[PDB]
Symmetry: C5
Subunit: 269 residues, 5 copies
Amino acid sequence: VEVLEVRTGPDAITQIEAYLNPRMGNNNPTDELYGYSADINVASSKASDNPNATTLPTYSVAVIKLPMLNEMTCDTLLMWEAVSVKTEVMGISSLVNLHQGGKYIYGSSSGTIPVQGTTLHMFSVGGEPLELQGLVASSTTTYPTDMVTIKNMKPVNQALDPNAKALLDKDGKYPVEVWSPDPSKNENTRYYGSFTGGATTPPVMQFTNSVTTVLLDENGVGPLCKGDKLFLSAVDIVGIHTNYSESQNWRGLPRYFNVTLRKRVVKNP
Amino acid sequence: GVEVLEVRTGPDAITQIEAYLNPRMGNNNPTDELYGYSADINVASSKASDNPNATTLPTYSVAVIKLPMLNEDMTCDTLLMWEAVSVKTEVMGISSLVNLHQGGKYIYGSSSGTIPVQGTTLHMFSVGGEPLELQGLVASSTTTYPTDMVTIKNMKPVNQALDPNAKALLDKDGKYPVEVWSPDPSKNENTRYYGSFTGGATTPPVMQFTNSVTTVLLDENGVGPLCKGDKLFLSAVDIVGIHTNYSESQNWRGLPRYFNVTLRKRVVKNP
Amino acid sequence: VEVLEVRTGPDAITQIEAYLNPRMGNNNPTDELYGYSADINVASSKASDNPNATTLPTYSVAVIKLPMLNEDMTCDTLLMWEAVSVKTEVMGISSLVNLHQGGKYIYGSSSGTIPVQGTTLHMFSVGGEPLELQGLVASSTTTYPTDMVTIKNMKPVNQALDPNAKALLDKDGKYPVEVWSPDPSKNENTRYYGSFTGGATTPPVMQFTNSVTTVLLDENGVGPLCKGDKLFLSAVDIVGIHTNYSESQNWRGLPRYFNVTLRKRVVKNP
Amino acid sequence: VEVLEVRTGPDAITQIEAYLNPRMGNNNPTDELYGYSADINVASSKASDNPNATTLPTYSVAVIKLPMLNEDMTCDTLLMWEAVSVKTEVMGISSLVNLHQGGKYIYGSSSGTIPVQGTTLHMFSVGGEPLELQGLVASSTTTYPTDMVTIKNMKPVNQALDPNAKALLDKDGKYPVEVWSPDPSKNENTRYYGSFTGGATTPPVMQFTNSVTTVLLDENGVGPLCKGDKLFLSAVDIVGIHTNYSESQNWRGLPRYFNVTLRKRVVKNP
Amino acid sequence: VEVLEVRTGPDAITQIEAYLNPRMGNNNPTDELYGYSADINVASSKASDNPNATTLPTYSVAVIKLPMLNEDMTCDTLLMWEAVSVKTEVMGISSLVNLHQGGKYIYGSSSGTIPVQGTTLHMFSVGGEPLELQGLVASSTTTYPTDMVTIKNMKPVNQALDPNAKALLDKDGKYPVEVWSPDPSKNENTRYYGSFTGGATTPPVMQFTNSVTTVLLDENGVGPLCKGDKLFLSAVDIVGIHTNYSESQNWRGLPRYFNVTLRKRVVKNP
Ligand SMILES: CC(=O)N[C@@H]1[C@@H](O)[C@H](O[C@@H]2O[C@H](CO)[C@H](O)[C@H](O[C@]3(C(=O)O)C[C@H](O)[C@@H](NC(C)=O)[C@H]([C@H](O)[C@H](O)CO)O3)[C@H]2O)[C@@H](CO)O[C@H]1O
Ligand SMILES: CC(=O)N[C@@H]1[C@@H](O)[C@H](O[C@@H]2O[C@H](CO)[C@H](O)[C@H](O[C@]3(C(=O)O)C[C@H](O)[C@@H](NC(C)=O)[C@H]([C@H](O)[C@H](O)CO)O3)[C@H]2O)[C@@H](CO)O[C@H]1O
Ligand SMILES: CC(=O)N[C@@H]1[C@@H](O)[C@H](O[C@@H]2O[C@H](CO)[C@H](O)[C@H](O[C@]3(C(=O)O)C[C@H](O)[C@@H](NC(C)=O)[C@H]([C@H](O)[C@H](O)CO)O3)[C@H]2O)[C@@H](CO)O[C@H]1O
Ligand SMILES: CC(=O)N[C@@H]1[C@@H](O)[C@H](O[C@@H]2O[C@H](CO)[C@H](O)[C@H](O[C@]3(C(=O)O)C[C@H](O)[C@@H](NC(C)=O)[C@H]([C@H](O)[C@H](O)CO)O3)[C@H]2O)[C@@H](CO)O[C@H]1O
Ligand SMILES: [Ca+2]
Ligand SMILES: [Ca+2]
Ligand SMILES: [Ca+2]
Ligand SMILES: [Ca+2]
Ligand SMILES: [Ca+2]
């Protein structure tokens, strides 16, 4: 598609908003531990590593249908162009809680250890599914068959196998420990991520309605919405909650999106 | 709601107000021996039995400042509203934490100083022309909260994530717990809020103080919060960590926040 | 006082420099532990908390007398010295880079000792009058030494904001940091800058350079104006806690350097 | 080579993309622990330090061949490819977000395992020729594997700067990071960017995005010029240490993506 | 001297390059632990603190002779070399990425060893004369080696600012960093830059690149001016502490590279 100029005039700009609930493993709102993974089940060896589906955080994705622009035989066409986004991790202050059941900070007269350890934040806004690259800590891990993982794994999958690719086309199915955004593709998606590891690391997060991320690339062009669909993807692992027994559950939070879009002219292909 | 027009120029078009908000850590009465702290945290015996005391739960601070009356005749084609333009804000008494002799848990053995306030911090301030709009989300949906507080009615496990029906307005001081409510980013068009969180149980608190820094409250259209009914809403929480006692019981510690807001007159189309 | 324009011309600009020695508790240069607090004496209970004056870090303050500007206080306009900018430096930072000082071993008795670490507090201010202070304490039941300046007749309200608990930083080595902090509701004529990191064992972080200048002008382009030709420099630089072999502990402080540039500002005679 | 102006016109710009797999020690794709080092083998003493080749992370390097530019090598001027900018990314970062991999429990046997943490080292470079290296080691008495490229006949001087300990990064997976680093006295024709955080258990920190570009032009507006139409990409990305059940440890590395934009630059015929 | 304008035309610019090897205590290139201090020897007591010379890191300093500018010192104006900018780099950073060196195990005897960590101190300066120093120590009762340059007849005042405790950094490997720091009340003809992070076990953090330049010009557009055509480069780069198996400890340092650009400045003949 040849990309032409921005369409001006009345009714040229639109806004959508949405939220994506976390998919930590307990992904059904009636689950007792909704917004958490099930207790982590650990490998006994290199050869034997069978994590349960409910213990693996996956990416969230939502597809937003935008107003229909083209009533298809005119020489040029219009596509929604995502220009900017306000995005927010909601319920951050829910972590400010030392009375929840858990492992004591000191002895049994103290509060309990709050959610801490590894965090992973990502959001993306694109005009099509986020393109993913496969890479795992162990190629001998047996992943649940009901999830989308790398077929026919080999030790090369512990690094870069150019054959290990996927589309983020299903909510709560693509494990974060298997897939990450592919920087060799994604010409029509903007993604932003941050990771801090460790076992007990204090999580750090901001929240404000004062910040906007601009989605335009170096040519001034934002993601272009193929078939008038807008793809929003996220993961927000905010750490690990430890139970009194010392079993552990990933904790995730929902993410809000507010995207501003405008009409962009393209040449009809 | 209303069609916003241009800024009103001329003499006395600008005003400024200052205020402070005391922390509401749980001991919220100034005669409370531990005013400015929570009571000893009472931990849940089980997920089914989680009954935190009201005095153990930090809540948002809110104050409403009545601004001068702007409109003599409410039938005129245009009217004026106070517009919050910028704010200087400051957490006060930061250096009170620089104290190693306060009763508590020794850093090393009985010859050393005591462990100062540390662990989870939560800082937030907001300036708006109406109550800060809130979204409910909890760590555990089976927690029973004190009934004299404002929390989510008839909680279900969905409330551990985003339930679009769990909405509130921050319309009462020392009543909305931080572990239940956070600013709703899907609303608050007429409020500007700023927040920061660092978790953990022993993390060193980090804070700045100065009178050289101003925050501009104008949105991308150059419009600040517009004060409905001439009321300015200031909200805050400033949990600076946890103090640990000799017995290893623990209290949240908060500090008060100062606001200096500059406002101007904005012309609006009469609805 | 109505503030008018900056006065141009030759000799319109002056510069001063000064240093402030820390006041950690041992505040006499003959004190064996000068630049440290005495061993922290800890409260046995909330009710019984009587810190020794020597264990309580206080603010440093110095008044610099500037060249007299007005030989005739009758003119319709007068001049005031305006603090425009400051280069400031915490001196002796590398003195902390020391693993042999007597103390608590990092590991066992074959290792170096634990260096100064834990809670830090850094503040400097430049003003045309004493720094204005707000009182707030960790515990209202603390009995402070009567020879220090602290809150009179404390009540639990002083654990938060009591609008009546105010003071001026008008004496060196007398106003405890744990009681007093800059009052953001005042200080129209002083610029202050403060940094705090808590914890018991936190690694201290400091920079030192002669390349950095802080501009003191407010949003109207006006710096602090020196009343009666007096410039107020205030500071505290608590760089952490030293631990002794017995596990007793001393606050450690460092001195601060100031180099202030001032210009002549015209004001209407009040 | 006298550098002249940028050649304008259609077809004056090209871009390449490449990925470099990590060289942590297990550097064969059929290695069970490909993308890790083997169990670290520790020195028994100062005198006796024989690390296995498989335990020493090395630099990754790839040479990208660019289109031919000059049909006639006798013309007074010639064209070279000039690297202008690069988008680069550490891939598979989220693979670390894994608490079930076999290893060492965080707490007791009911908990998850400790994820990859400790020392990290990230470096990328883009140049028109091999990255120039300087040799320096923690210990000159270490015996390095003979089929790696290390400093010949070390003496204690090699624990600091020995001006004779120089090399070119001209072999993938052969130059250990613990022996070699970018030489700042050379590398006129390469841009290199490096970041190190030490410690035994430090939480790793990484960002990933497709919104960030690094501009490679020097202070004269000239980027790396590709000699013989070759572009050199070099990298190391050690993301920490994995700890096994027995407490043995493996370095963990991640692959790096490059997307480089290049333009035609006129040079005087040498 | 009165400083006039920059001299333009061909050959008005020059560049020099140099490196400075660390002076951690073992300061002779034939020393087995060159680039480290000897095992820290800790004070028996406050009164008996006698650190060994080889345990005390000192500043590095090099004087570079520049081309002679004035063939006639009779002319009304003279030329001086003016240092305009510097590229500087800590070399060998990746040498610390090494878990096999003999030392203390991270966990038990099957794990790697703890890498260099704890207190770091980084400083570089570029000047037209020796860097001016201020004395300040953790303890005035320390007895320093007499073959080092330290504060004469120390008293407790030297635990803070004594305005008489001054020196010039005029000898390499002689001035202890724990005794001397840059004097911000002087150094009008030197630009210095310093960073400190303390703690016992802190992860060291360092970057390396050839993409960063520091401009040495002051607020008036004048860089350091080289008296007698001599350029002074000073540094210290303590990157942390190595812990041995026995738990004895050695400071670790790295060398620093400088690339300085200078131009010709006109000054009035005195
Ligand atoms: C009955 C019997 O003896 N069976 C053994 C079987 O135990 C053994 O498996 C290895 O046993 C060890 C026990 O200490 C570990 O459980 C190995 O798993 C790990 C480890 O923890 O060491 C898992 C870890 O994730 C792996 N590291 C990485 C980076 O993936 C390591 C790693 O492969 C090894 O440590 C080698 O560096 O292994 C477990 O594989 C098998 C295989 O040796 O032999 C049977 O006979
Ligand atoms: C001889 C005798 O029995 N005397 C007791 C006396 O011990 C007791 O005083 C309290 O004793 C406890 C011992 O566990 C502590 O020493 C109390 O001090 C602290 C504490 O460490 O808990 C100091 C601390 O600074 C306070 N917390 C804050 C936030 O300021 C707390 C706090 O007030 C309480 O823990 C309640 O949350 O106290 C010390 O007061 C007295 C009072 O019970 O009774 C005598 O009989
Ligand atoms: C054989 C004999 O009896 N000799 C003693 C000798 O031990 C004693 O010296 C003091 O001993 C104590 C033992 O706990 C400490 O080692 C003192 O050193 C320190 C300390 O660690 O406490 C060193 C430390 O650097 C100092 N602190 C600061 C901030 O400088 C402290 C400090 O001076 C005191 O703790 C006061 O706060 O001292 C060590 O001096 C001497 C003197 O008591 O008597 C001999 O006879
Ligand atoms: C069989 C026998 O008795 N052989 C000895 C042998 O003990 C000794 O070797 C030294 O043994 C000690 C025992 O604690 C250490 O293992 C020494 O290795 C280290 C150390 O851990 O101390 C390794 C470390 O990397 C080195 N430090 C640095 C900064 O490089 C230190 C260092 O050289 C010393 O601690 C001095 O500061 O050594 C190991 O060398 C030898 C040599 O003395 O003598 C045999 O006869
Ligand atoms: Ca591609
Ligand atoms: Ca909305
Ligand atoms: Ca006021
Ligand atoms: Ca060179
Ligand atoms: Ca001076």
